[PDB]
Write an enzyme that holds these catalytic residues in place. Structure first.
Site, PDB file in Angstrom:
ATOM      1  N   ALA A 249       0.494  -0.860   0.318  1.00 16.98           N
ATOM      2  CA  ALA A 249      -0.050  -0.088   0.036  1.00 16.98           C
ATOM      3  C   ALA A 249       0.736   1.154  -0.415  1.00 16.98           C
ATOM      4  CB  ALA A 249      -1.011  -0.380   1.273  1.00 16.98           C
ATOM      5  N   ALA A 250       1.797   1.562  -0.384  1.00 19.21           N
ATOM      6  CA  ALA A 250       2.661   2.470  -0.680  1.00 19.21           C
ATOM      7  C   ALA A 250       1.809   3.531  -1.190  1.00 19.21           C
ATOM      8  CB  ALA A 250       4.453   1.962  -0.513  1.00 19.21           C
ATOM      9  N   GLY A 251       2.152   3.027  -2.858  1.00 16.05           N
ATOM     10  CA  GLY A 251       1.458   3.184  -3.689  1.00 16.05           C
ATOM     11  C   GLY A 251      -0.574   3.927  -3.571  1.00 16.05           C
ATOM     12  N   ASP A 252      -0.647   2.975  -2.937  1.00 21.62           N
ATOM     13  CA  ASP A 252      -1.603   3.159  -2.638  1.00 21.62           C
ATOM     14  C   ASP A 252      -1.655   4.731  -1.958  1.00 21.62           C
ATOM     15  OD1 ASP A 252      -3.361   1.211  -4.095  1.00 21.62           O
ATOM     16  OD2 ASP A 252      -2.768  -0.138  -2.025  1.00 21.62           O
TER      17      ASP A 252
HETATM   18  N1  LIG Z   1      11.600   2.295   0.287  1.00 20.77           N
HETATM   19  C1  LIG Z   1      10.606   3.870   0.215  1.00 20.77           C
HETATM   20  N2  LIG Z   1      11.214   4.551   1.146  1.00 20.77           N
HETATM   21  C2  LIG Z   1      11.024   5.750   0.556  1.00 20.77           C
HETATM   22  N3  LIG Z   1       9.943   5.460  -0.087  1.00 20.77           N
HETATM   23  C3  LIG Z   1       8.832   5.028  -0.636  1.00 20.77           C
HETATM   24  C4  LIG Z   1      10.003   3.573  -0.663  1.00 20.77           C
HETATM   25  N4  LIG Z   1       9.218   2.833  -1.382  1.00 20.77           N
HETATM   26  C5  LIG Z   1       7.886   2.839  -2.083  1.00 20.77           C
HETATM   27  N5  LIG Z   1       7.964   4.164  -1.613  1.00 20.77           N
HETATM   28  C6  LIG Z   1       6.853   5.813  -1.868  1.00 20.77           C
HETATM   29  O1  LIG Z   1       5.715   4.986  -2.352  1.00 20.77           O
HETATM   30  C7  LIG Z   1       5.530   5.364  -3.552  1.00 20.77           C
HETATM   31  C8  LIG Z   1       5.042   4.016  -4.327  1.00 20.77           C
HETATM   32  O2  LIG Z   1       6.095   2.683  -4.179  1.00 20.77           O
HETATM   33  P1  LIG Z   1       6.150   1.964  -5.884  1.00 20.77           P
HETATM   34  O3  LIG Z   1       6.509   2.565  -6.620  1.00 20.77           O
HETATM   35  O4  LIG Z   1       7.162   0.776  -4.496  1.00 20.77           O
HETATM   36  O5  LIG Z   1       4.556   1.727  -5.151  1.00 20.77           O
HETATM   37  P2  LIG Z   1       4.068   0.072  -5.696  1.00 20.77           P
HETATM   38  O6  LIG Z   1       3.947  -0.151  -7.154  1.00 20.77           O
HETATM   39  O7  LIG Z   1       4.480  -0.898  -4.333  1.00 20.77           O
HETATM   40  C9  LIG Z   1       2.905   0.700  -4.664  1.00 20.77           C
HETATM   41  P3  LIG Z   1       1.395  -0.097  -4.148  1.00 20.77           P
HETATM   42  O8  LIG Z   1       1.308  -1.367  -3.919  1.00 20.77           O
HETATM   43  O9  LIG Z   1       0.374   0.348  -3.700  1.00 20.77           O
HETATM   44  O10 LIG Z   1       0.610  -0.337  -5.625  1.00 20.77           O
HETATM   45  C10 LIG Z   1       7.336   5.858  -4.503  1.00 20.77           C
HETATM   46  O11 LIG Z   1       6.842   6.806  -5.262  1.00 20.77           O
HETATM   47  C11 LIG Z   1       7.466   6.418  -2.722  1.00 20.77           C
HETATM   48  O12 LIG Z   1       7.136   7.772  -2.328  1.00 20.77           O
HETATM   49  O1  LIG Z   2      -2.018  -2.459  -2.484  1.00 18.83           O
HETATM   50  C1  LIG Z   2      -2.538  -3.265  -1.787  1.00 18.83           C
HETATM   51  C2  LIG Z   2      -3.631  -4.717  -1.706  1.00 18.83           C
HETATM   52  O2  LIG Z   2      -3.961  -4.850  -2.619  1.00 18.83           O
HETATM   53  C3  LIG Z   2      -4.719  -5.848  -2.643  1.00 18.83           C
HETATM   54  O3  LIG Z   2      -5.735  -5.203  -2.531  1.00 18.83           O
HETATM   55  C4  LIG Z   2      -4.718  -6.011  -0.529  1.00 18.83           C
HETATM   56  O4  LIG Z   2      -6.216  -6.045  -0.304  1.00 18.83           O
HETATM   57  C5  LIG Z   2      -4.076  -4.852  -0.700  1.00 18.83           C
HETATM   58  O5  LIG Z   2      -4.804  -4.398   0.878  1.00 18.83           O
END
Ligand SMILES: Nc1ncnc2c1ncn2[C@@H]1O[C@H](COP(=O)(O)OP(=O)(O)CP(=O)(O)O)[C@@H](O)[C@H]1O
Ligand SMILES: OC[C@H]1O[C@H](O)[C@H](O)[C@@H]1O
Ligand SMILES: Nc1ncnc2c1ncn2[C@@H]1O[C@H](COP(=O)(O)OP(=O)(O)CP(=O)(O)O)[C@@H](O)[C@H]1O
Ligand SMILES: OC[C@H]1O[C@H](O)[C@H](O)[C@@H]1O
Ligand SMILES: [Cs+]
Ligand SMILES: [Cs+]
Lengths: 305, 307
Positions: A249-252
């Protein structure tokens, strides 16, 4: 400030930390297990809400007890859950998540009621979408439903913000309606057919998206921040450096807080800064929704910088 | 006329099972086509296969003090299992397993041990009289190694037959292997314990020999569809299973193990005993989930006599 509608899924996340992912036929024992509220739409709605947006959430739970709990929680997260429907005879979505020693995860999802978010539920929200300043969606909802809502927003000058996750290919017809898209590197490759290994790649995948009709492209680059491009003018905005702990959920978090900042009329770079901050707090906490920072916390983090 | 008493010691889980096409790849997210929550755990599965199959069986195990724990205890009681020696561990949750089954039916499992991890040597020791008086003791490797060893030593000193299903896969110390009378590895476990790859009956013979030389008189290496290689003190023999259409093979071995010990306690010879076990598991593979797929003795007899 402006008005946000998020439309997307709700899951209950089951998360098991282990050393290595099991291989086929294998069984591994984990070292931490957690049950929490997840789902890309709900995570994004919560990032917006807690960030201080005026946000309403279009989504579906099942008619079960978990669906009941998640609704009560969502209401305390500064979110208008009036458009959150209850689907009789259906279960609330479930995600089963393994996270390895590096922090990589794989995710299996049981759609449940999320599959019941139909064009007809979208049409019932026409008015809501037509008056919103922005509409933010992901791809854990039926594509036909994403498409119907994108069409309504477009007709009515609502900003369409699309986070194309989880990864898959999308029709030109959808992409032409989007104003802001936020692929990670895997997605950008899936949508443009260009593997993203460096800033020059990032700018190339962006160009193919600008020619699809999308004016604002942000390609997230993990710990390398984001590649932000507005009709071809692009630069990297590095994220903050923190001791990462959980990346789910970082991207979320980033998407929810991005849109919140934009609707406050902060310019893109200030908004990406706001968002990067929110995500960085998120990666130091466990789980998806429990990890999502509050505005005051995001503001206190930025002052400390 | 009741057969000798059977004791099963091992784990109990709530299974979360998601069928999908292909296992998720790293960083990947996939949507499945079916989801199910059911009772599982290798020890519980085996206890239920033995009970439904007709054994006189008691189950040594730990659940947590949550609602799932109480539900599993009630359900096990209706499976012809004596649950007196199933402990409720305060402050812990019941074990949980997250399971993906792909399009062919290969599966992957991650487990959170919870209360299973509380099954200690102190608890086994409290069951000392019980193990010493039973005709057999059936165990797996989902419980702490220290406890399996304490149980094996009690059984061995009282000439209680020690039957070990060495799953999940791992390396075991000679000290334990020397106490086992019957082992049931699959091809993967056979390899992990002997170092020998098993692709055919000839390989199985070699793998069995190492196990026999480690002290194990009866070695049964399961060969999935091909049946089983049965070996006693080096004398091997192949015993085919039945052919049926597979939907789900979760708990197939567990079923095999449980009905195997039951028929041996009925004094059926090894060949027929294994055939009875084959029949149970073959039914089991046509049904979803784990415990819910385990057949009752009535159905096993009907199926054996049918064809
Ligand atoms: N290790 C880290 N340290 C600091 N910030 C980080 C980080 N990893 C991710 N982020 C932050 O989170 C944002 C999304 O990162 P990432 O490209 O990994 O998204 P994601 O595809 O994993 C997301 P999600 O799981 O919600 O789809 C980045 O733009 C950055 O700001
Ligand atoms: O982005 C992470 C999310 O993706 C999946 O939807 C899980 O439910 C989790 O909360
Ligand atoms: N495809 C199949 N068709 C018929 N019977 C099967 C079968 N797969 C498994 N069985 C039954 O289950 C027994 C053990 O199968 P297998 O070798 O796959 O166990 P395993 O240790 O690999 C898995 P598990 O113990 O979870 O089943 C076989 O002897 C057979 O009786
Ligand atoms: O053998 C299948 C079982 O093993 C795992 O421990 C799961 O609980 C499942 O029920
Ligand atoms: Cs997190
Ligand atoms: Cs089964």
């Amino acid at each position: 400030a402006g008005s946000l509608v998020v439309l997307g899924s709700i899951n209950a996340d089951h998360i098991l930390n282990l050393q290595s992912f099991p291989t086929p036929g294998e069984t591994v024992t984990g070292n931490h297990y957690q049950v929490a509220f997840g789902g890309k739409g709900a995570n994004q709605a919560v990032a917006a809400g807690r960030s201080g947006a005026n946000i309403a959430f279009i989504a579906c739970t099942g008619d079960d007890s978990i669906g009941e709990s998640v609704r009560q929680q969502l209401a305390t997260d500064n979110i208008d859950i009036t458009p959150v429907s209850v689907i009789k005879g259906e279960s609330t979505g479930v995600a089963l998540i393994f996270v390895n020693g590096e922090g990589e995860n794989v995710i299996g999802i049981h759609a449940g009621a999320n599959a019941a978010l139909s064009p007809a539920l979208v049409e019932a929200q026409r008015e809501r979408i037509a008056n919103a300043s922005a509409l933010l969606m992901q791809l854990e909802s039926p594509l036909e439903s994403v498409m119907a809502a994108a069409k309504i927003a477009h007709q009515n000058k609502t900003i369409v913000a699309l986070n194309p996750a989880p990864a898959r290919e999308l029709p030109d017809e959808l992409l032409a309606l989007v104003d802001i898209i936020t692929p990670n590197e895997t997605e950008a490759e899936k949508l443009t057919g260009i593997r993203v290994e460096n800033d020059e790649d990032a700018a190339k995948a962006a160009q193919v998206l600008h020619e699809k009709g999308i004016r604002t492209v942000l390609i997230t680059l993990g710990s390398r921040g984001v590649w932000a491009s507005v009709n071809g003018e692009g630069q990297r905005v590095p994220g903050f450096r923190v001791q990462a702990v959980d990346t789910i959920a970082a991207g979320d978090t980033f998407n929810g807080a991005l849109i919140t900042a934009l609707l406050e009329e902060k310019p893109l770079p200030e908004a990406i800064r706001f968002a990067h901050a929110a995500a960085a707090i998120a990666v130091t906490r466990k789980g998806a929704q429990p990890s999502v920072p509050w505005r005051e916390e995001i503001d206190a983090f930025l002052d400390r910088q």
